[PDB]
A paper describes a structure:
The β-barrel assembly machinery ([name]) complex is a conserved, multiprotein machine that mediates the folding and membrane insertion of newly synthesized β-barrel outer membrane (OM) proteins. Cryogenic electron microscopy (cryo-EM) structures of the [name] complexes from the gut commensal [name] and the oral pathogen Porphyromonas gingivalis are similar and reveal a 7-protein, ~325-kDa complex with most of its mass on the extracellular side. Remarkably, besides BamA and BamD subunits, Bacteroidetal [name] contains a 14-stranded integral OMP that is intimately associated with BamA. The remaining four components, named BamH–K, are all SLPs and form an extracellular dome-like structure over BamA that may provide additional functionality to enable the folding and assembly of the many β-barrel–SLP complexes that are a hallmark of the Bacteroidota.
Class 1 lacks density for the periplasmic components but has good density for all extracellular proteins, whereas class 2 has modest resolution for BamA POTRA domains 4 and 5 and for part of BamD, but with poorly resolved extracellular areas. The crescent-shaped BamH subunit is positioned over the BamA barrel and forms an arch-like structure approximately 60 Å above the OM surface. BamH interacts with BamI and BamJ on one side and with BamK on the other. Based on its structure and the conservation of the protein core, BamH probably functions as a scaffold. The highly conserved N-terminus of BamH is wedged between two strands of the BamG barrel and interacts with the conserved BamG N-terminus, and the tri-acylated BamH lipid anchor is positioned at the BamAG interface. Of the remaining three components, BamI consists of two domains. The small N-terminal domain is conserved and interacts with the BamJ PPI, whereas the less-conserved C-terminal domain contacts BamH and adopts a six-bladed β-propeller fold, with each blade consisting of three to four β-strands. The conservation analysis of both BamJ and BamK indicates that their putative active sites are directed towards the interior of the [name] dome. BamH–K all have glycosylation sites, with by far the most present on BamI.
Numbering used by the authors:
A (entry chain J): 27 to 214
B (entry chain H): 34 to 95, 98 to 436, 446 to 492
C (entry chain I): 28 to 196
D (entry chain G): 18 to 537
Write the structure that this text describes.
């Protein structure tokens, strides 16, 4: 197969229809102030085919400390494979693996670059699981499309197609789902 | 038509190779680092290699000039230490055109005595001069003399030669009574302490006495303040002890301010600090009697001091001889060890810093191996090991085919010790040993 | 510029060789016999001895280590390599445009035959300027930066020599 | 096939072609030592130790750190039996040992709230992991650790931290000591066979006494239970109410400075083994026995989601004295001394107007290290030159090297030089700034007034920096820079030129510029 692998849209449509999920266009997302309603399970159709839901826009009392260029951002997440419905990557605590202290003790941290074009990001510290499993330092480009829409300590959920995935998703043409429990500005 | 060289020899110990210097101007070969004493059984049939030169034809005088067996083994035991009774392995090397002619002479340098071994000799070098050897002992060095004090106002002495620890010195066989005698009333001899050029002493009534030469003693006007009272003098810090970048000069001790014990430091020619808000309290685990101390320079250029001694008569969960250190005179800190690497409980322990390591000796009380049994050593002050080999206690002889009658090993007696400025260990035994022992590790006397 | 390099370099060596044999005061030159080729000579010039000798009498051996300030130049005076670039080694140098020179460690058996012959006859703190033929330099094709068949001239200061690096560095 | 014609032809080319010349000219730069100020450190390494130097005096360091707690982390639920009407046990849930009075459970201490047992504590232990260190590695040293917070004390926050001289005595109280440990930075208590392993990372292991362990572990466990019972989740802010953090202090020892990479705390507890189907306790498989148990733990560590700070104390009088030397300038790295240079931008702007600048070279050069000390301070390997307008803003905004306002260079040990080799962009930037100021002012311009104000228009500073690279794109090697930060390990170098160059021309640097002169 060469072009047949780009049928990932069928798998994403399967993953959508398997659950209660509604699609909102960005031109509606930016006009009902800015929120994806959680009682209705809204998702925005972002650029490059990313579907994204903000669960908590973050920093609700300060409202000012948004992300920007040259920041270093800490990420905690759990990654689900779309094609076979399996938890593939994580660095967060859950009771089913509570005693595996190596997996969740340290977060992933990346530098955020936002010059006039071509936003990109590089892991400074990879988590143990990512560092052993995927062994690459390039951040999934789908994550970086969400930063301009959220603040510090935000909680977001993303569906990322292959064109903007990581170094494995781009080769084996596999979309993924990320439950980003937290974006944080890096301290110390 | 050259005579270039790379002369080499194979492993004597497993993985151990010895380097040879090549003096082409003077035409001779030798190894700078001498072969160990063990090697005279190994070089009995040994192999030469890497004897590379412009043309390999080489011969040794035998009457004939027979060719070298470069690929075959050779007995070198005839050619060791060839500088006197000179018997070099002398060999001739030819140029590729056979016109230019040269000879080189080879010397296999080998030790006559084991380097890292503590040499006590066959016998103790002198008897203990003290009358009634059951009395308390103390030994200290001052200038060019070694002094031995006894509690009954009794003093003995011996003198040291001109200098240079590497020279062929002999001393200690004769001891003299310092006939003026009369160290002060009520003194406690085991408290005697050195400073830059003076000796200090403590009495039972807690007066401090001092001397310039050990012959005569007086009270001093600077340490005997009112209000305070001294109870122990620990050690003294000075420029003479090391290389202190901290610039510390004075005496460290313990003073009982208003009935409670505090560490205090008497800086050069001024009285003890007595300000109770900025002294520190002596812990209950700290040694009380028969203290020993040493001062040395850390590799950073900063002085450090270490002490051991007898504790109070009874205290909880105590099973080991912990050593207390201090970077200055204000506060001592214990080198407590959580693991099993902690040395046993010892009675009247003594500590020294010596040949880039630390050593402790004392007598044990486990009732199945009582007495002095071995030295204990540490490379880094926080882990302690027993030495089961060289560096033994005095009187422990190797097989000449044994235990010497006046040896410390297995005895339980009073004693004292010191290290002089030629790095001789001096050990003095009381009732039950009655002798003076002297020793040094051979590696400290070598010119290398 | 670099025309007929070999002949002119050899002619330079011959000029020094016969100046030592005919000029008054030897023209300032002095010479040593070469042990790798008896009958050949290396020519050198004595210079200002140092004033901070580490008091190490004797001369270095073939298989032991050496600490030096050195500079290497070709017949035209152009730079090849060294610790210093002016006309003297720099220590506590007043001029803020030049740094104090580092010291370098060599093994007498690990250098060109000219160095290997002359270093075995210095005493610590001698300064010599030495003139070596292309037979005993790198020679033939030469190294990087050497045009082949080149007679190098070196300026050497011997600071220290020892059996191992760890007692010298 | 020839392609040269040599040089024949010049002389009949037009004047604007054959008049162009190259030229080299030099201008004078003065340099002086300046104090560091309040730098923004913000590093993840914690420095602990002390050492003495004969030139700079005593250097002492210690650090404060908060411990993290992952979202939703909890300790296993207490083991609870279920019985039918006969008293016979039928099923059970939970895993943690909860029953006292049993001589088999004298190995742990049970902890409570109200009158109910919520769990047990076996031990609490701190590991301070470190990859490397500075100085000698057989000098014995001692370290002691305190719990942060208390009655009336301050707490770490985004404004208090990242200054290298916070006074810890108002963050902690001396009576809250947790423990102490003696260490040597190479622990000869551990066998060589273990220390050679590739998986071995050194640490100081400073586990607490039973009373302290009970107090700390009970506080943490009761906070976790109090969060769980309210259907909250035990995020780090709730953990910080039970254990604020640690202060790590150096009591004794001279020579070692440890680079603590991650402080880590384990809380250890006792658990039953339970049947996979029916949940009951397993009986021991050996002879005799009463039940089967094992020990398990939860981990709390400083992981860049929480605050960590350092105290890096230089000897102030010695530093102030060395700043006042005028024959030389220093570069003492851990918040010590920088050197400031004044560029001759006005002279370049006057003398080389109409030229194309092809290179502007500035060189700093140094004396050798003194004393031949075995474990002495090293020369800073990488330094940054930055316009003084951006001295502190550069590190506070986490910028990378700009090219037009800051440069990086390595030490050239073969010549004892820092050389920057082309700073043309910075010169053009300064010239453009002044020309724009003159253009905006117009006829009311005054050159002397504008040079008397804005005195740091043409000033640059030289700073020791630590530069780190990415590792990817490895086979087609590129090695991009991803973080520049202040160098905080001990190190120094003495540079030539100095404050006396303000008056005496022997002590003044030269800046070398080469350009194309069109002869117009």
């Amino acid at each position: 197969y060469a072009e047949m692998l780009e049928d990932e849209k069928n798998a994403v449509n399967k993953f959508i229809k398997d659950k209660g999920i509604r699609i909102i266009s960005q031109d509606e997302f930016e006009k009902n102030d800015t929120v994806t309603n959680l009682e209705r399970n809204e998702y925005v159709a972002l650029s490059d085919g990313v579907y994204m839901q903000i669960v908590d826009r973050g920093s609700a009392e300060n409202k000012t400390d948004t992300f920007a260029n040259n920041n270093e951002i800490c990420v905690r997440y759990i990654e689900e494979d779309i094609m076979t419905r399996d938890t593939t990557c994580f660095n967060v605590f859950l009771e089913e693996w509570g005693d595996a202290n190596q997996l969740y003790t340290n977060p992933a941290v990346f530098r955020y670059v936002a010059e006039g074009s071509y936003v990109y990001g590089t892991f400074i510290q990879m988590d143990y699981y990512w560092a052993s499993y995927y062994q690459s330092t390039a951040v999934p480009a789908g994550w970086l499309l969400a930063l301009p829409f959220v603040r510090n300590y935000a909680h977001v959920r993303l569906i990322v197609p292959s064109k903007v995935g990581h170094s494995s998703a781009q080769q084996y043409v596999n979309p993924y789902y990320y439950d980003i429990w937290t974006f944080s500005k890096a301290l110390n | 038509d050259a005579t270039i060289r790379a002369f080499e020899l194979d492993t004597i110990g497993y993985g151990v190779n010895y380097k040879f210097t090549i003096d082409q101007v003077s035409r001779l070969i030798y190894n700078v680092d001498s072969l160990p004493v063990n090697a005279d059984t190994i070089i009995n049939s040994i192999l030469i290699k890497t004897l590379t030169t412009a043309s390999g034809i080489v011969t040794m005088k035998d009457d004939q000039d027979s060719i070298v067996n470069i690929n075959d083994s050779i007995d070198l035991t005839k050619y060791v230490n060839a500088t006197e009774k000179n018997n070099f392995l002398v060999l001739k090397v030819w140029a590729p055109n056979m016109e230019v002619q040269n000879e080189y002479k080879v010397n296999i340098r080998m030790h006559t005595m084991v380097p890292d071994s503590l040499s006590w000799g066959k016998d103790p070098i002198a008897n203990n001069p003290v009358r009634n050897t059951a009395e308390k002992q103390k030994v200290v060095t001052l200038g060019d003399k070694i002094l031995l004090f006894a509690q009954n106002n009794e003093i003995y002495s011996t003198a040291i030669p001109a200098g240079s620890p590497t020279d062929r010195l002999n001393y200690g066989q004769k001891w003299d009574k310092e006939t003026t005698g009369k160290l002060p009333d009520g003194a406690d001899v085991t408290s005697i302490i050195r400073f830059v050029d003076k000796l200090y002493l403590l009495t039972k009534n807690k007066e401090v006495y001092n001397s310039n030469d050990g012959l005569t003693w007086t009270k001093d006007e600077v340490l005997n303040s009112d209000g305070v009272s001294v109870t122990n003098l620990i050690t003294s810090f000075s420029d003479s002890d090391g290389s202190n970048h901290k610039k510390i000069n004075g005496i460290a001790g313990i003073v009982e301010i208003n009935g409670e014990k505090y560490f205090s430091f008497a800086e050069k020619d001024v009285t003890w600090e007595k300000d109770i808000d900025k002294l520190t309290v002596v812990p209950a685990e700290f040694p009380i009697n028969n203290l020993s101390a040493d001062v040395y320079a850390t590799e950073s250029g900063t002085l450090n001091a270490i002490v051991v001694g007898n504790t109070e008569d009874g205290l909880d969960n105590d099973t080991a001889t912990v050593v207390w250190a201090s970077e200055d005179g204000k506060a001592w800190i214990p080198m407590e060890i959580p693991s099993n690497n902690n040395c046993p409980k010892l009675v009247d322990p003594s500590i020294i810093h010596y040949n880039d390591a630390f050593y402790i000796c004392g007598k044990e009380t486990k009732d199945d191996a009582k007495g002095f049994q071995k030295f204990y050593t540490s490379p880094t002050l926080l882990v302690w090991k027993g030495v089961d080999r060289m560096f033994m206690l005095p009187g422990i002889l190797p097989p000449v085919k044994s235990l010497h009658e006046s040896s410390f090993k297995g005895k339980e007696v009073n004693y004292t010790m010191v290290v002089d400025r030629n790095h001789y260990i001096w050990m003095v035994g009381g009732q039950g040993i009655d002798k003076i022992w002297r020793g040094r590790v051979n590696k400290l006397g070598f010119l290398i | 510029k670099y025309d007929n390099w070999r002949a002119r370099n050899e002619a330079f060596i011959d000029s020094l060789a016969n100046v030592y044999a005919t000029a008054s005061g030897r023209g300032g030159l002095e010479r040593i016999e070469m042990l790798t080729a008896p009958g050949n000579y290396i020519y050198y010039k004595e210079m200002e001895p140092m004033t901070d000798h580490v008091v190490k009498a004797g001369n270095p051996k073939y298989t032991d280590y050496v600490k030096v300030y050195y500079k290497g130049t070709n017949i035209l005076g152009e730079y090849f390599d060294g610790n210093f670039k002016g006309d003297n080694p720099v220590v506590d140098g007043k001029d803020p445009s030049e740094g104090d020179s580092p010291t370098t460690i060599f093994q007498v058996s690990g250098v060109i035959t000219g160095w290997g012959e002359v270093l075995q006859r210095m005493e610590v703190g001698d300064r010599w300027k030495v003139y070596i033929p292309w037979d005993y330099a790198y020679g033939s094709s030469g190294t990087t930066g050497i045009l082949g068949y080149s007679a190098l001239v070196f300026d050497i200061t011997l600071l220290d020599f020892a059996n191992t690096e760890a007692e010298l560095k | 096939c020839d392609d040269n014609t040599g040089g024949l032809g010049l002389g009949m080319f037009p004047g604007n072609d054959q008049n162009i010349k190259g030229k080299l000219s030099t201008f004078d730069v003065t340099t002086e030592s300046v104090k560091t100020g309040d730098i923004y450190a913000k590093t993840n390494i914690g420095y602990i130790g002390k050492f003495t130097d004969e030139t700079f005096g005593t250097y002492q360091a210690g650090f404060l750190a908060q411990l993290n707690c992952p979202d939703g982390l909890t300790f296993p639920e207490p083991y609870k039996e279920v019985t039918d009407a006969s008293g016979n046990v039928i099923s059970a849930t939970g895993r943690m040992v909860v029953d006292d009075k049993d001589p088999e459970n004298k190995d742990v201490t049970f902890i409570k709230d109200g009158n109910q047992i919520i769990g047990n504590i076996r031990a609490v232990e701190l590991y301070l992991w470190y990859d490397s260190y500075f100085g000698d590695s057989l000098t014995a040293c001692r370290l002691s650790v305190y719990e942060l917070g208390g009655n009336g004390k301050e707490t770490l926050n985004l404004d208090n931290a990242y200054y290298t001289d916070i006074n810890p005595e108002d963050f902690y109280d001396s009576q809250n000591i947790l423990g102490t440990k003696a260490y040597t930075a190479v622990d000869l208590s551990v066998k060589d066979s273990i220390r050679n392993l590739s998986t071995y990372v050194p640490s100081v292991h400073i586990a607490f006494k039973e009373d302290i362990a009970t107090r700390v572990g009970g506080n943490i466990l009761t906070a976790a239970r109090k969060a769980k019972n309210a259907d909250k989740e035990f995020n780090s802010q709730l953990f910080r109410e039970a254990f604020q953090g640690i202060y790590v202090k150096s009591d004794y020892g001279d020579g070692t400075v440890l680079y603590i990479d991650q402080p880590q705390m384990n809380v250890v507890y006792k658990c039953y083994a339970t049947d996979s189907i029916t949940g009951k306790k397993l009986q021991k498989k050996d002879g005799s026995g009463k039940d089967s148990t094992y020990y398990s733990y939860r981990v709390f560590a400083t992981t860049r989601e929480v605050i960590q700070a350092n105290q890096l104390k230089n000897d102030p009088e010695r530093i102030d004295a060395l700043i006042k030397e005028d024959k030389n300038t220093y570069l003492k790295s851990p918040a010590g001394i920088f050197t400031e240079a004044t560029l001759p931008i006005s002279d370049i702007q006057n003398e080389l107007t109409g030229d194309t600048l092809n290179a502007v070279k500035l060189t700093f050069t140094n004396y050798n290290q003194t004393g031949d000390k075995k474990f002495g301070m090293a020369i800073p390997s990488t330094v940054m030159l930055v316009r003084k307008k951006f001295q502190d803003s550069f590190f506070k905004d986490n910028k990378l090297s700009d090219g037009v306002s800051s440069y990086l260079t390595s030490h050239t040990s073969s010549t004892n030089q820092y050389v920057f080799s082309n700073i043309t962009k910075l010169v053009n930037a300064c010239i453009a700034e002044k020309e724009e100021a003159k253009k905006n002012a117009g006829s009311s311009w005054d050159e002397t007034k504008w040079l008397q104000e804005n005195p740091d228009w043409n000033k640059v500073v030289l700073i020791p920096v630590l530069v780190t690279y990415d590792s990817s794109n490895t086979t087609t090697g590129q090695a991009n820079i991803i973080r520049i930060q202040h160098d905080l390990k001990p190190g120094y170098v003495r540079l030539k030129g100095g404050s006396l160059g303000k008056t005496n021309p022997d002590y003044k640097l030269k800046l070398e510029v080469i350009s194309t002169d069109f002869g117009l």
